[PDB]
């Protein structure tokens, strides 16, 4: 039929209007599935893997990854949403909805014989105007604890149950405020997220310290030390084989015993260095050492340390070196050549918790920790995964708010105002690109539509109420999900990240423009 | 069809509570007789 | 005009074997039906009159029991909602130890009544909110339903009476004897320190003599034999070594370099003399029993036999640690003689045969020790396994009593009182949540209903009598098992009591599982493919 | 689903899936048949499984000759089949309007609106639209010029321009010939005979009949100037007794006598015919033609040819009535009482040979009430296309005659109807105004498709036409050569009023029924 099929008989090709139809159908399907995620009133989806793992989720990116889809346009939209999640950490469902509505509105005119190029030109003009309006409408504000609490609520309520969201808000805001250095970028690696599987979902909390998923391997070591010095080291305390193939040669049993006793001198020197430091630092039984080691410790060294009342942990995570040096305040050591009491961290309490066949070590009551941990607790694995995803979204939202002092009213108010501004600006656009501008505005209007639809109210009537209120008052009125009436999102506290909105606009416009200009799909790499 | 489905649905509740189906059947027959009586009672005449 | 094409959009993009269920009828009702089916499968094993089920897993292994958690574990459950309910039951088992069947039954009843409410017109959100409110009310009410406290855990008789109810659901006919055994075993453990360790109770299953011949031993039993000739010590001085009972060797590579004839002729003799010196040094400390975690060399065994030293070789490091705990020794890493602190002591170590299995017994004469063991006899492996499950339930009950001493009346009395009070509260509450609250209250009836059905009486008469009696004001009245006619009796005076903490956790977990199932609206199942494990 | 539990091998589309499936099928049919509308449409080649070639742009033929297995396609095909069967035109517009109605309805349904409101709006809009169509129709006296204009408006859309110009005269003349004043027109009286020997422009109208069969006996005359026509339905071949007669003889002479005497029954009727011929024409100037619906055995043919009589056998059943109406005699089922007054007259009868087939022409009748059109072309597909075109033209002219009204075409009526519907929209209560707007936009598809097929752009052409209509109030359509608005009445682009009314009714009914379908189910196995 086509040229490709002539050259390659086993090739699949869609040309001209077929390509547009295929892409728009895929976008519409994705949008139809993800409609129900948007908003705190959205429905929870249940995902079962091939192995049978159960995952309860509401996140757009998580749902997209676990889709059973093999469509090209779906793959493109999934990649765009993945980038959105990677950078800003929120707005994936909004991304998909806006892309789908942009494509639908563009098709509404393209099916009338209009060329896609004009629609794309209108799209870019409307995007420029919309970015200007978003710059106009953002609310620059120094963010104390209250504003961060509001933002964290606006995210977590959409992700999880209301009470769980209420707990997680305090958890995430306190953690971010704890690890936040003045006028410095926030390092989210410094907030460890640990999962325990015994208590209820609301028992998750924040520990002003660190939690390690392993404990001491010697039964004789202390299970709880009140006042503790912390030694963070990256030195192997187990037996090490010589790099150059030593081998031992002896002529008698006594010589063999001498060689056996003398083959551990190297490690025993470092162990005795640690022992000497401990005895110099604390001559009483009041205090104690906790030795967190990134590398292993053989049982001989464990016994030697336990004989001196020292608790030691082996095979710690690499990030835990920085985490402990930032929380306890010591110095991570790659060798014991010159170790002094000044390189020792401090912790006001260290104890071990046993849960089934897993040991957990708590390092808390630090002086002023710059790295904390978020202990996730729940009765199910899927509950833990859902809480972990929600906490990631909340952490990203709070960090985004801290990064730029501005914050954008939510509940669809900003999209309504942007659509009205675009409609007002439409006559200024010369040519037939006014059609593209109108399509862009109507596509932006999808967020209040989906919010009202998910809340159960009528779609068009609620939207016209919101638009009439905004036009007559000029305020930033959103969708009240409880009554459907216009509501001032700024006063209630429904806030959205400005960076998230900007990324939404840019990425959605770019991907919609690129898709609309595609006029052929080829699969001819075979044979 | 809807009525028969609903009657069977509500009878399942009793069948799951150690009630023999004959008792349910007798109750249903009494109910049907009283339904006929009430329907004839609340009827109105029409001149064709 | 003979084929219905797939709807454009997501339906066409779905994978080859994937399934997508959406809406009420396709998803929520199906999940409720699956959970109800699972509850029906496990229902008949509830209470003292519960019936054992013979479950054969995929590995051709036979399980016979009425423990709900074990049955669910051995069943290859595939429906994901039932999987969620099973996870809830397993969480209840891990947190408390008893109440798995209660969790399953309550969750099933709650989901059935939720389906009823959805059919009559309520929304999922309203049902969920009503269940949450009713669960909060039940958790508030429950502390007021406590009838008595343990008030003593060092008494054999009191502990046995407390534990009888827990191990009456399993092994109904002969529970007094098992209660006495577990009470003695638990009182041996649980020192003046308030901490109680479940793993300190070991169970040894020796086949042959009927379960009535079981006993409690203050020590440990290992189903193995002694390496040497000495087979009995009356003043044991155990010295425990985690290293192999052999001359220690290098770690990189050891080769015996011989350069003269004299070295070749003297090497083996010197090695033997060194081993003899080490063994005699060990023996000179008074030690007469040696326990090693590794192999035993021939020369070492010969020299130990020369000096009259008992050899025991423990294969698993867990057994070595448990023996060190129960004797008071420290697992040395070398062949050095033990200092007086590291030397373990025991009243008697000997080799004995029970049935046809040779065992090594570390027996304490004192009524104390870190670790105590129960020797279970019986005529079948499956019977001993079931008795072990009952013992585990009793030990977990003792642990819960150590954690919390409050007890509530059993035999459905607590469930009826909770149902009555929640129904009373829900009537005063206006709005659409009253239906959900009333259904939550009614879901408590499934416990006395299951008990009455399993006992062979009419459940409706029992429930009506229970409501009447609780209406006059007797809140400690449950159904009487030993009656052919529906009858009720006081449970506080009958001693049929279950732990308050178990009830609290079971109610919380069942409510959470039911609500979590109700929250689901869409199911996107991938192709099952394989996944053997 | 619920159905799939009872029947595992069942296919079900439920809720929005049913709407999506139906609307997708309707849009596919619309996308295929857009290119057919208007004289500037595109020829389509239709190759069958056996390799037969059909060239057409007719909506119904194309619909029946696509390879579609869709339920909605089947429903639309049935609607178009009914439209073609009754009115003979408007099938392409039928499909286009149905598809656009469903598309415009879905445009509002996807916003959460319920289809019932859309259907209520459709009903109100249809009532108002029918009122406007009654207001806008043009009542005229159907003279030759108006009929020619209508026939052109159909044929130009169905075939090439010059061929359409020839077919206009053919169709109009035939209809005017067979039509009796104040009497329903019988299109069975217009025979459509096709020949395959000359160019397509040689198709003409014969004021008589053309028969696909000729004289069998070679000695009969090939051309008779003045002829008496004897239309008969009497068997002239040997007939067997119904009661198993059989013959019994005892000698060769008796066998010969029985052989001779067994032909007496047929010979009596042949002699009756011959005696009537001799009585009517005692000279050789006049001629005698016998057209028989039944067979004639060679003996009777020889006997007739001995008297100089042309005889044709196994004529078509309709040809009895056609010859009775044209020649003017009477069809005879028996020769019991036949008189010179039962004979029709024809001013010329001759036989034409074309390859292996022979044709007989009966022309120069006095006042033929039944005529024939001789389709001529070099190809089979050309003949089929001309046959479809002349069928459409005959239907159009008959419809125009039946009711003295005719509607301006070229999309003008749809534009005016849409404007009137938009003006009437505020008078509709509730949210049915959305359905009314959807109906108006659906009606506007005809000018849009005409603009596309002419090569212009939809939006600019449509706004120009709508602005002109609003400013002047005239019925302005689409000028397919310039794209400017143009008064359809003045130029002669006419549409059948019955066709428009049928379009409105059928399209609205089928769209309402499809929009209200919420489950497509196949569980009959
Ligand atoms: N309490 C609330 N009331 C009204 N609108 C809300 C409320 N909380 C969130 N929203 C709005 O709902 C949207 C939630 O989107 P969300 O489901 O998080 O999509 P994504 O995960 O892609 O960001 C936000 O745009 C916000 O404006
Ligand atoms: N002697 C008894 N009389 C009446 N009820 C009893 C008696 N013993 C136990 N029960 C009831 O049996 C229930 C325990 O059932 P069980 O089989 O243990 O399920 P689970 O293991 O899930 O708790 C308790 O609620 C208790 O009230
Ligand atoms: N010469 C012309 N100029 C402008 N419009 C025309 C002309 N001839 C026909 N039309 C319009 O084009 C349409 C032709 O439709 P047609 O192809 O006949 O569809 P159908 O065969 O289904 O009736 C008519 O509606 C008529 O109004
Ligand atoms: Mg979000
Ligand atoms: Mg139990
Ligand atoms: Mg036509």
Coordinates of N, CA, C and O and ligand atoms in Angstrom, one line a residue, chain D residues 58 88-93 153-154 157-158 392, ligand 6:
Chain D
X58 N -22.8 6.3 -5.8 CA -24.1 6.3 -5.1 C -23.9 5.8 -3.7 O -23.1 4.9 -3.4
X88 N -35.5 7.0 -3.4 CA -34.5 6.9 -4.5 C -33.4 7.8 -4.4 O -32.6 7.8 -5.4
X89 N -33.3 8.7 -3.4 CA -32.2 9.6 -3.4 C -32.0 10.0 -1.9 O -32.9 9.8 -1.1
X90 N -30.8 10.6 -1.6 CA -30.5 11.1 -0.3 C -29.8 10.1 0.6 O -29.7 10.4 1.8
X91 N -29.3 9.0 0.1 CA -28.7 8.0 1.0 C -27.4 8.5 1.5 O -27.1 8.4 2.7
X92 N -26.5 9.2 0.7 CA -25.3 9.7 1.2 C -25.5 10.8 2.2 O -24.9 10.9 3.3
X93 N -26.5 11.7 1.9 CA -26.9 12.7 2.9 C -27.4 12.1 4.2 O -27.2 12.6 5.3
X153 N -30.0 18.1 -11.6 CA -29.5 18.1 -10.3 C -29.2 16.8 -9.7 O -28.3 16.6 -8.9
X154 N -29.9 15.7 -10.2 CA -29.6 14.4 -9.7 C -28.5 13.8 -10.6 O -27.5 13.3 -10.0
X157 N -24.9 14.9 -10.3 CA -24.2 14.3 -9.1 C -24.0 12.8 -9.3 O -23.1 12.3 -8.6
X158 N -24.7 12.1 -10.2 CA -24.4 10.7 -10.3 C -23.4 10.3 -11.4 O -22.7 9.3 -11.3
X392 N -32.1 6.8 -10.3 CA -32.1 7.9 -9.4 C -32.9 9.1 -10.1 O -33.7 9.8 -9.5
Ligands
LIG6 MG1 -28.4 11.9 -4.8

